[PDB]
Amino acid sequence: MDLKVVVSLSSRLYTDEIAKMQQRIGCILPLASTHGTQNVQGLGLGQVYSLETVPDYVSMYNYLSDCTLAVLDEVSVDSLILTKIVPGQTYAIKNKYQPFFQWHGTGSLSVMPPVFGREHATVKLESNDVDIVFPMVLPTPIAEEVLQKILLFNVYSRVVMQAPGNADMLDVHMHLGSVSYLGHHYELALPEVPGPLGLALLDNLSLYFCIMVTLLPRASMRLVRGLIRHEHHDLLNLFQEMVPDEIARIDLDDLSVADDLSRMRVMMTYLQSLASLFNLGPRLATAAYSQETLTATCW
Amino acid sequence: MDLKVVVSLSSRLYTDEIAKMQQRIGCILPLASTHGTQNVQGLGLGQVYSLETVPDYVSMYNYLSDCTLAVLDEVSVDSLILTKIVPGQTYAIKNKYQPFFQWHGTGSLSVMPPVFGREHATVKLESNDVDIVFPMVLPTPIAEEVLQKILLFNVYSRVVMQAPGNADMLDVHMHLGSVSYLGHHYELALPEVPGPLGLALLDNLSLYFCIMVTLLPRASMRLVRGLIRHEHHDLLNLFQEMVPDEIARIDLDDLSVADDLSRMRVMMTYLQSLASLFNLGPRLATAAYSQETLTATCW
Amino acid sequence: MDVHIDNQVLSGLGTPLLVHLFVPDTVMAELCPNRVPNCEGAWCQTLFSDRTGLTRVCRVFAARGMLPGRPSHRGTFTNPFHVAALRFYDEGGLVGELQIYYLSLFEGAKRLVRGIAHIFSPHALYVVTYPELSILGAPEREFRFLISVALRISASFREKLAMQAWTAQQEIPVVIPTSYSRIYKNSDLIREAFFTVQTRVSWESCWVKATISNAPKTPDACLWIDSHPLYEEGASAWGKVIDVALGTDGHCVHLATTSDGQAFLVLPGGFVIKGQLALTPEERGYILARHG
Amino acid sequence: MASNEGVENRPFPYLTVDADLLSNLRQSAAEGLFHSFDLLVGKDAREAGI
């Protein structure tokens, strides 16, 4: 019910880094194991993310969700005082990310690996030959958008192999490259080569997709095939007057409510399971916020 | 420790208005602010639900996911008293919503916007020229059934409106009017028309679900074709037998690469947004229930 | 035989009819010497005995396996006159094109797996048949195509020598031993260099890749070199990229092509001769259909 | 400029001065009149430890 964790440093502070660490007060980082005394290298995210190593971000998500998360509380010349995240406790939080994102009230926050920039969220302590890597806390919308972009890139990279360069320039860096915000645009770091352990999510995705596409309903296809041709809609701006003929080929047979209903039941049941393969991030609920202090109360 | 909120009204109520809260003492309410007394208007759902305009389901789901829940506790000529809903704390519930219903121990309650008439569930306070709207509470399985069935009926009504050739209103009503659970039978109302567009429930779960289910086969074929390697999961190989031949003969060279990316990303966003809707958002359990008292001990 | 049911769901996408196959390891040893790479990337192509061609069906991504017969070692699993082409590769840059002639796939499907003769390489190829379901011109086109293109480059080099009053200079600062007094017969240098330049032909030569450039910006700063040994002391290497050492090491004839149409003949001793590259729209288009 | 660059938080014995400073405080703090200013909300407005 009361948890205070001290991490001891063998070497000294080396004040060159302490100022940057001190304006870095009150922010999250995941620690290795829950004990009163910790090792210095297990403290940051520096273990999972080596400088020479190519980033595979689903592995970073897997490491990040497993480890306990801690609130930085105070840096001392030889000490790191951090209270941790008890699952049933409420505490304040204050954040400053160099990719700076503005929060709303009662908006759930997701914890993610620092996909944007290594120099940004990582502080090198070469005195111990270590590097403290802070994780990224974002509002849930932008979090799921960025994760989806990451997985779609991990697919289309395997796809765009041996295709015209017009595939190489466009899909690889038009939508999978940048993430927008209100009058703002942030680039992403992209894995030069497709990463293993990322598609391990995609295999399960393909499984669910096979099972779901075995049980798709019929009437919805008829409604859409009618509405694209007879009427105009903004959601139907995507489809032009021409229809993908796949829908025409599946559509051929008549309707029956008794068939649609059991398909709908099993489709609903297979839709509750996707939330496990889509979250991959510990979520924090907002209770109150002040832009004048940038200090919210997450939960 | 305390979580009570006392709202003070500006104008003194009429005698007729008092009676219905005393009827609806046991009901949940939304609450915009967890702080002080606070302007009256925040409490009801009349902000999200528009008596002026036909409101979508999206606003109601997104609001009830994030906003605070409260219980009516006591009512006086000016004063209204509410008790905040906090996780991990036990409360008492009455079924003062209208749609008469059964309760069961270990029942999984979920809070969702009233699909029925709000005027059937709301009260209008003419002293303060305001409206208090009460959100719907339903056990999890039957709520799944209700949403699934009403969306199926909407799709069927829009289809019979579009192309009168395949149109069975009587069997549609016969299959979707009845709800049978635990040996109990409930007949729910079905609207007369889907309308030209957007009659307060139609657009969201019809259009999003329809476009997602139209895009899922093409996206799944693209993903499965891209995903085959040596190290991939074995069950993928087996389920590749499951898919239909017409979905198997679908061409990937037809659609442009940029259009392929657009469809993939849009369908993934739609499916990810639709999955959590069917988890039914605000969840809770129960310890026991007493019928003749109408009292559910919830937590 | 799992990749065969893996294909046929979406196999109808690219091509109307296909033939299942299996390739021995000694047969692959022509493509990928000094290596035994997996073939997960390996993407097929198609080829017709006329000007018309269609490619890029990308038939099968197939793992290695032993054959159903016990005495089948460890081979790689996967008009009667044409040169059907296949292209194997992996995640890396190890790519190889193999030829197949009909009368081996049509007659090879005789009767559920059977060996057939391979005309291009003197070894057997195994064909599996699912039980429930102008002869010399066709191989001679690519050869004379590339030969005439290289001869055009050679004629350009000769005219550029004519422009310089039949003399040469250096453009790569490598100090020669200065002992060249007809040692190595300084004329024999260019005789044997032109020997190897005009004799050697490969679909993956430097100018092949240099003709087909993805961008305007990068390939201007990019050079495509290939150096081959003097007097056939070894094998040749084609298509190295320059994001010099090759002028230093003797007994290596160096050929460097730009994206702009410049060719450069480097001799041992750093001397450079310039030539021009010219391809009509038809040959450019044929090479774009092949390589791209 | 930045909020906390040279602001020391340590608990000094402050002098109680008569003149009134509160006028136009939050506006001049938001627009940025004076550099190296620090705002502390009610949870963090106490005498710091030693």
Structural tokens at position B38: 């606070």
User: What is d(CA C24, CA C77) in angstroms, rounded to the nearest whole number?
Assistant: 8
Q: Characterize the bridge pairing of strands B91-93 and B295-298.
A: antiparallel
User: What is d(CA B198, CA A234) in angstroms, rounded to the nearest whole number?
Assistant: 13
The shortest C-alpha distance from C129 to chain B (Å) reads: 21
Q: Amino acid identity, residue C200?
A: R
- Helix or strand holding residue B31 (H, E): strand B28-31
Nearest by CB: D4 against A23, A290, A295 = A23
Residues of chain D that touch chain A, judged by Cβ-Cβ distance less than 8 Å: 4, 26, 30, 39, 41, 43
User: What is d(CA B191, CA C130) in angstroms, rounded to the nearest whole number?
Assistant: 57
User: What is d(CA A148, CA A135) in angstroms, rounded to the nearest whole number?
Assistant: 18
Distances (CA, A) of C15 to A245, B211, B253: 19, 30, 12
Structural tokens at position B226: 């891209």
Cβ pairs bridging A and D (under 8 Å): 9
Distances (CA, A) of A166 to A178, A267, B222, C283: 18, 37, 19, 22
Cβ neighbour number for residue D49 with a 10 Å cutoff:
8
Which of B145, B225, B227 should we substitute to test contact with A (largest number of A Cβ atoms within 10 Å)?
A: B227
Nearest by CB: A170 against B175, B258, B265 = B258
Touching A: C residues 37-96, CB under 8 Å: 41, 43, 56, 58
Taking contacts as CB-CB distances below 8 angstroms, the residues of chain B near A258 are 175
| Residue A87 touches partner C, C-beta closer than 8 Å | no
Touching C: A residues 136-175, CB under 8 Å: 161-162, 164-165, 168
Cβ pairs bridging B and C (under 8 Å): 30
Q: Characterize the bridge pairing of strands A79-84 and A5-8.
A: antiparallel
Tell me the sheet residues that pair with B180. B185
DSSP code of A235?
G
Q: B45 with B133: CB under 8 angstroms?
A: yes
Taking contacts as CB-CB distances below 8 angstroms, the residues of chain D near A295 are 41
DSSP code of C170?
B
Question: Residue B223's Cα: distance from chain center in Å?
Answer: 31
Q: Which residue has the tokens 């599996």?
A: C128
E strand map for chain A: 5-8, 28-31, 37-38, 68-76, 79-84, 93-94, 109-112, 122-125, 130-133, 136-139, 178-181, 184-187, 283-284, 286-288, 295-298
Residue in chain B nearest A230 by alpha carbon: B162
DSSP code of A2?
-
Q: C41 with C58: CB under 8 angstroms?
A: no
Taking contacts as CB-CB distances below 8 angstroms, the residues of chain D near A23 are 4
E strand map for chain C: 22-23, 43-44, 76-77, 83-88, 96-101, 113-117, 124-128, 223-229, 240-242, 252-257, 262-266, 272-276
User: What is d(CA B238, CA B234) in angstroms, rounded to the nearest whole number?
Assistant: 7
Q: B198 with B54: CB under 8 angstroms?
A: yes
Q: B13 with B21: CB under 8 angstroms?
A: no
Q: Taking CB atoms and an 8 Å limit, are A295 and D41 in contact across chains? A: yes
Tell me the sheet residues that pair with C76. C23
Resolution in A: 4.0
User: What is d(CA B132, CA B125) in angstroms, rounded to the nearest whole number?
Assistant: 7
The shortest C-alpha distance from B203 to chain C (Å) reads: 35
Which residues precede a break in chain A, with C-to-N distance above 2.5 Å? none
Q: Which residue has the tokens 């930085």?
A: A72
3-class secondary-structure state, position A296? strand
Q: Taking CB atoms and an 8 Å limit, are B243 and A213 in contact across chains? A: yes
The shortest C-alpha distance from D18 to chain A (Å) reads: 28
Q: C21 with C126: CB under 8 angstroms?
A: yes
Torsion of CA A259, A265, A266, A271, to 10 degrees: 140
Maximum distance among all Cα pairs of chain A, rounded to whole angstroms: 77
Q: What are phi and psi of A172, to 5 degrees?
A: -70, -25
Structural tokens at position C119: 């005309």
- Determination method here? cryo-EM
Nearest to A176 by CA among A198, A157, A196: A157
Chains B and A touch (3+ CB pairs under 8 A): yes
User: What is d(CA C253, CA C226) in angstroms, rounded to the nearest whole number?
Assistant: 8
Taking contacts as CB-CB distances below 8 angstroms, the residues of chain A near C58 are 162
Taking contacts as CB-CB distances below 8 angstroms, the residues of chain C near B223 are none
The b/e string for B64-98 (b: 16+ C-beta within 10 A; e otherwise) is bebbbbbbbeebeeeebebbbbeeeeebebbbbbe
Q: Which residue has the tokens 């595939």?
A: A167
Residue in chain C nearest B246 by alpha carbon: C9
Q: Taking CB atoms and an 8 Å limit, are C43 and A165 in contact across chains? A: no
Residue in chain A nearest D26 by alpha carbon: A292
The b/e string for C109-122 (b: 16+ C-beta within 10 A; e otherwise) is beeeeeebebeeee
Residue in chain A nearest C89 by alpha carbon: A162
Residue in chain A nearest C289 by alpha carbon: A164
User: What is d(CA B75, CA B123) in angstroms, rounded to the nearest whole number?
Assistant: 14
